[PDB]
From a paper:
[name] WM88 has PtxABC, HtxBCDE and PhnCDE ABC-transporters for the acquisition of phosphite, hypophosphite and organophosphonates, respectively. These transport systems rely on a high-affinity periplasmic binding protein (PBP) to impart ligand specificity. [name] is a typical type-II PBP, with a binding pocket positioned in a deep groove between two domains separated by a hinge region.
To probe the role of the D206 in ligand binding we generated [name] and D206N mutants of [name]. When we assayed [name] [name] in acetate-free conditions at pH 7.4, no binding of hypophosphite could be detected up to 400 mM of ligand (data not shown). In the structure, the extra space generated by the alanine mutation allows for a single molecule of acetate to fulfill the role of D206 in the WT protein, forming two hydrogen bonds to R178, and a further hydrogen bond to the indole ring-nitrogen of W68. All of the atoms of the acetate molecule lie in plane of the guanidinium group of the arginine, forming a classic end-on salt bridge interaction. Clearly, the high concentration of hypophosphite in the crystallisation experiment along with the presence of acetate favours the formation of a closed, ligand-bound complex of [name] [name], that would not readily form in solution, given the weak binding affinity for ligand. However, the observation of acetate binding to facilitate the formation of the buried salt bridge in the closed complex of [name] [name], suggests that this intramolecular interaction is a prerequisite for capture of the ligand.
Residue numbers in the entry: 2 to 63, 64C, 65 to 157, 158C, 159 to 242, 242A, 242B, 243 to 262
The structure:
């Protein structure tokens, strides 16, 4: 962050919460514009296609305020001391769940013991719900996805849902709040898929700043976001996202723990 020609400038970044960067920016830029306006700041914004990429951007000093996925925040905190200021609310709650979605007609009565050799697609290794949590689940039951499934990694949630719907894979990861938004936007036909597995509750996205971020600004940003009403917040964000709660590192313990156990 710097003051340019007397005017504060902020660099924003948004994780790939919606299926494409343009959708993500169109739907969530307004909360960032609001934030910048409360500070009298200019801004710039990007939304990378992968979850790992926004973590790396924050770690490598390119981002003043980032909306990071949980594992992206934990990784960046470990590497660079990135600080979480607040957690986003979805339907009024600072949590969400990971999914494994399957084709609607997939036999699953003995899941996942009846799924050997099926085509499973996980997301990039920076994706909490899309990679970290499902990998932790398989490892907890002694399954190595790369040798158990016809396995692919690195897909986006948009690719996973599309490929399931069109019969190109059997199984793919998603997150509940993400799937909800895709159904609400008419982007998938939910008759063609079903939830096969859901995780326990996970902490939601981490509104994050670099380690040495200006303390006065940090405090203002936190108050600006957390003081929003549900109605005002929702007016500025994609459907379902409707506020922020003050957060700290220990709120992400379950994610840190999962990452540790996977090495």
């Amino acid at each position: 962050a710097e003051v340019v020609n007397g005017k504060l400038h902020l660099r924003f970044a948004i994780a790939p919460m919606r299926p494409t960067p343009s959708q993500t920016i169109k739907e969530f830029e307004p909360i960032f514009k609001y934030l910048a306006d409360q500070l009298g700041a200019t801004y710039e914004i990007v939304s990378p296609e992968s979850w790992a990429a926004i973590s790396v951007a924050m770690t490598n000093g390119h981002v003043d305020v980032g909306w990071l996925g949980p594992w992206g925040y934990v990784l960046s905190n470990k590497k660079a001391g990135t600080e979480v200021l607040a957690t986003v609310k979805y339907r009024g709650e600072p949590f969400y769940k990971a999914l494994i979605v399957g084709r609607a007609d997939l036999p699953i009565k003995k899941w996942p013991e009846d799924a050997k050799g099926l085509k499973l697609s996980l997301s990039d290794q920076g994706n909490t719900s899309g990679w970290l949590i499902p990998m932790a689940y398989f490892k907890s039951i002694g399954i190595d996805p790369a040798s158990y499934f016809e396995y692919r990694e690195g897909a986006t949630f948009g690719q996973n849902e599309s490929q399931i719907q069109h019969g190109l894979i059997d199984l793919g990861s998603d997150m509940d709040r993400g799937r909800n938004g895709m159904i609400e936007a008419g982007q998938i036909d939910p008759s063609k898929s079903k939830i096969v597995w859901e995780s326990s509750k996970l902490p939601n996205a981490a509104i994050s700043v670099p380690k040495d971020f200006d303390p006065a600004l940090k405090a203002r940003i936190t108050e600006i976001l957390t003081s929003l009403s549900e109605e005002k917040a929702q007016s500025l964000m994609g459907s379902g996202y409707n506020g922020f709660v003050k957060a700290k590192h220990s709120d992400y313990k379950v994610i840190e723990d999962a990452g540790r156990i996977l090495g």
